Design a protein around this ligand. Structure first.
Ligand SMILES: C#CCCCC[C@@H]1SC[C@@H]2NC(=O)N[C@@H]21
Ligand SMILES: C#CCCCC[C@@H]1SC[C@@H]2NC(=O)N[C@@H]21
Lengths: 322, 322
């Protein structure tokens, strides 16, 4: 109903104490019995709410669905983000963000349970199944030159990697400049875009797609060997809200470092997290393809590559296949 | 009515011959007498249409109003632009374009008779009065790295300057990197923005504001001495459609050169058109201001400046006051 989010919000707000129907009913100025129907609905949708006579209701566990109601709490208490928008299904959180940023200087992020037109780099199709990944776009407002985009993109990587690590028992590595892996499985893709002019950046839009709970069964047949989910490397149930919380916190930490540190500060760190070394990398550039080794990430985030013909290259970006 | 643009379109399409009401009536499958009411309305709005018994109607002169009807002809016959959108009044053609470009690869432009929230660089207020200027945003789709924005911005300048020249008896000069002048009056401001990622530009959005027909009386009192309009330097009535036609043609020419020539090809040309030489320029950078001379535009479009303390600078952009 009209009030599901409101009741959910109250339950989350009130943890770890119980609140009575009566009490919710008065907050919302709605009948006790309406509160009871909304509570039954939340249980039907898979909310885990303990209900005890006299005492009331306690939100125990959210299902794999995003609720504006709850996400609003993450934005109320946040220093970076003005608001968020949450959707059950949309063409793409990236398209939404690029539209929603126009005409304002808000910082915000967009989450959706599913995307019908999810896209990564080069307009490639990104699978965004309902129930199974965090499909998010983050719009921030750094006061910097447009060439700093590549820098943003390196700091944010380590933020994303750190959040995924906190949940996986296995080793999580960045594949420069835009992908995160656990062993041979891509568990995340991200994409930093900007709106900018010569005088600086109007907005950064970072689209982040992370596979949360797919079982292997769930992956398209061709990609099965090179794909994975945080679930498949975590002993406990992975809780999306718990993860989002961690992800937002890391983004903020890395975004602050992005504003205050030169790349050289995190370069070693980035280096150690990266999985592109000591191995033959396939590179694509327009028509061309060639093989190569990654020699180094210079102090400006450029990849130093020694190609199969012995020539050296200095790349701000690339698409690498393993 | 529902058909004004349609009838207008037919009149423009049919120049320099007359078409009868009957003939319009059959094209549109509407009554002769409805055609007559729509023709009276167009005359009321200030269209100059010669109407002769037996023979029909001939569009002689459009008023200072943009008509989707006519602009559609400019897009039908165009090699660069997929469509246009025309508005009588909007917050900003720049805001519209940044929204309208999302999710597609169309090239297009947006015109509006008036803007209620026109903005130039640094979110500065740009006056966009109904009836008096061309307030346009142009979205193009160059397949290039994001650092090429500054290059785009230099080629487009000369396109804009060339169109304004064709109509002014006086000398039209560019004030790098974003303004056009006739003597001491700014007659145009433009602004190149981009949407981009590390792999290249998704869209260029060039907002162009050009004062067409202001009399001095029309300019805010403070700015009167440093502002001007193409009208105030043209002996003939300035015809906005005629100008738009010229502007679109120049944009296309300079956009083609942008895709095919290095800056060094047009640098001399740019140099000769520029009005920033042999004079004390005031510069703003954040908190700072300082005075300076423009020594040179290097081969990469960077301004070489000798500041008042004798130090040299190499600037991709600046805001200069005379
Ligand atoms: C291919 C590939 C991985 C690129 C990351 C996709 C994220 S999902 C949320 C946001 N929305 C998109 O359409 N793309 C980004
Ligand atoms: C200050 C100043 C001049 C910047 C140019 C304004 C053009 S008008 C059409 C387009 N729409 C805008 O809001 N800005 C651009």
């Amino acid at each position: 109903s009209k009030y599901s989010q409101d009741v959910l919000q109250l339950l989350y707000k009130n943890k770890p104490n119980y609140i009575s129907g009566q009490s919710i009913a008065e907050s919302l100025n709605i009948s006790r019995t309406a509160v009871k129907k909304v509570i039954d609905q939340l249980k039907l949708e898979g909310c885990k709410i303990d209900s005890v006579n006299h005492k009331g209701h306690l939100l125990q566990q959210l299902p794999d669905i995003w609720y504006q109601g709850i996400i609003d709490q993450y934005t109320k208490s946040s220093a970076l983000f003005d608001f968020s928008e949450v959707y059950d299904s949309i063409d793409s959180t990236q398209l939404a963000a690029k539209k929603s940023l126009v005409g304002n200087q808000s910082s915000f992020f967009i989450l959706s349970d599913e995307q019908t037109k999810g896209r990564g780099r080069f307009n490639r199709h990104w699978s965004s199944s309902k129930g199974q990944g965090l499909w998010m776009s983050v719009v921030l407002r750094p006061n910097v030159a447009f060439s700093m985009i590549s820098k943003f993109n390196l700091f944010i990587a380590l933020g994303i990697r750190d959040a995924i690590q906190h949940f996986s028992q296995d080793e999580v590595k960045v594949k420069w400049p835009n992908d995160i892996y656990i062993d041979n499985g891509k568990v995340c893709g991200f994409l930093t875009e900007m709106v900018a002019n010569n005088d600086g950046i109007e907005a950064i839009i970072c689209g982040i797609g992370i596979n949360l709970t797919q079982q292997l069964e769930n992956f398209d047949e061709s990609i099965r060997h090179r794909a994975t989910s945080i679930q498949l490397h975590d002993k406990n149930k992975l809780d999306r809200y718990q993860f989002l919380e961690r992800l937002l916190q890391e983004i903020e930490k890395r975004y602050n470092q992005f504003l205050t540190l030169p790349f050289s500060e995190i370069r070693e760190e980035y280096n150690a997290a990266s999985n592109i070394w000591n191995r033959t990398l396939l590179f694509t550039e327009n028509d061309k393809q060639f093989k190569g080794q990654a020699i180094d990430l210079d102090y400006d985030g450029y990849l130093i590559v020694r190609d199969e013909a012995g020539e050296s290259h200095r790349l701000i970006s690339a698409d690498i296949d393993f």
